[PDB]
Symmetry: D2
Subunit: 33 residues, 4 copies
């Protein structure tokens, strides 16, 4: 119930953290240019 | 160069759009509860 | 506690709205970089 | 146009900051839902 949504939202927070991390890696690539 | 970062950022925008879409699906699951 | 579910729906909705605004801005930066790129 | 790369770095940095703030808020909503959940 609520637990199904807790699992699904946790997955999305994990996905969102990957977005931020990977954008940061691109920022370093660009900062260097 | 810039093209490598354009590809990598596009991938992250695609990932971010999945975050928003999937959170919205969980919101519907919760709104219904 | 049912007030609780409604509160979290409203809260998460606000975050989705902010994610959508981020995605719009990132798409704009992508265009900016393409203009440098080609 | 080099000003251009720097501008996009600053712009994307602002968006990463906003994503990090979203993630913090979503983590808080996750805790709220867990409190309903268990
Ligand atoms: Cl993924």
């Amino acid at each position: 119930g609520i637990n199904a949504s807790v699992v699904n939202i946790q997955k999305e927070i994990d996905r969102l953290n990957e977005v931020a991390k990977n954008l940061n890696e691109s920022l370093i690539d660009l900062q260097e240019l």
